[PDB]
Symmetry: C2
Subunit: 205 residues, 2 copies
């Protein structure tokens, strides 16, 4: 009920979509970062043994657990009308989430690898599915009925798009420079449409 | 309205679309593209990726739908297969996310030479497949009903059947004598939707 605790390990990993949803909805939460050396003793206490996870405690001390980051974000976005106003908007929200998920899948391949292997996979996907999936997302952004990803108000599709673009720029600062104008335009409109999210991203840097 | 499902893999990502329409009692048409035809068909598909759904009205106007699970979620939404409440809606998505992880491991073995396929097959069966199966079994016990979420069919039920069939493709005997909640879910699901049972029986 009352207190929402986000348990995670990666600084800007899958938990970013939970935080950005809560911030855009104006809901408070507490960060609980688990460390590498502590994870062996913490894992048996997490249902499913996987992070990130969400812990909810009420006025009375009863603990409710929530698993699977994007499932958690979908629930919080639904509760605050960030999953489309209609069934047709709901589809378009999920359509962009699915495409963002594919781009995130390619980015994830480079994670937790030795320096030489990480460089090899980065070089491979940047010449591969990353530009192909970026063009697909740009077409989905152009088909919007408003200034944001789906319609004119914030939805979950807006948030996971910001998170995955920051992952792309992590692979290459210059990869989007002078290209993909609809992606640059989406972020500018999104910051202008939610000052709380802009406050969150500005202070995070 | 005519629903055309465009796909290439016999039992790929489109299975969740078919099973949703079958459980809802909505008709559709299978349109399988071939490997040698794909070079000429791809420029006609928005996004250039399959599977995709093509909707034609009574007047001939075409509207396209992309991203299989986004299509399935929309069809399940229109026929009340995404949970009756917001809390049930979360429970459907929790199991879909876990099924998605199991499908992600299965996909690594796909469309590779025989020896490479066997090696990756060995790695995930001794790796994340049993770990993710135990997680799915725990979510099945936590349901308030006989199925995956509640007592009526949801999208979580359908994607679970599809991913379990992919597991048995890796190893016919991997679930033999194990994971009783998974065996019990399928048994309850077939009894709870005769159309789906007809679809799976005739498919074999
Ligand atoms: Na995370
Ligand atoms: Na398919």
């Amino acid at each position: 009920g009352d207190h929402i605790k986000v348990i995670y390990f990666n600084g800007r990993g899958r938990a970013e979509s939970i935080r950005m949803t809560l911030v855009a909805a104006g809901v408070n939460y507490e960060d609980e970062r688990i460390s590498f050396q502590d994870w062996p003793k913490i894992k048996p206490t997490i249902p499913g043994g996987r992070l990130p996870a969400v812990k909810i405690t009420d006025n009375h001390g009863h603990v409710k657990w929530m698993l699977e980051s994007l499932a958690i974000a979908r629930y919080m976005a639904k509760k605050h009308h960030m999953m489309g106003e209609t069934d047709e908007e709901y589809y378009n929200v999920e359509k962009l989430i699915g495409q963002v998920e594919d781009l995130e899948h390619e980015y994830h391949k480079t994670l937790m690898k030795p320096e030489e292997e990480k460089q090899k996979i980065t070089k491979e996907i940047l010449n591969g599915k990353v530009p192909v999936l970026l063009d697909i997302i740009c077409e989905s952004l152009k088909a919007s009925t408003g200034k944001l990803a789906v319609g004119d108000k914030v939805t979950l599709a807006d948030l996971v798009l910001i998170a995955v673009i920051d992952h792309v720029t992590d692979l290459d600062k210059e990869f989007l420079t002078g290209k993909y104008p609809e992606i640059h335009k989406h972020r500018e409109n999104l910051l202008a449409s939610s000052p709380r999210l802009a406050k969150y991203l500005s202070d995070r840097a």
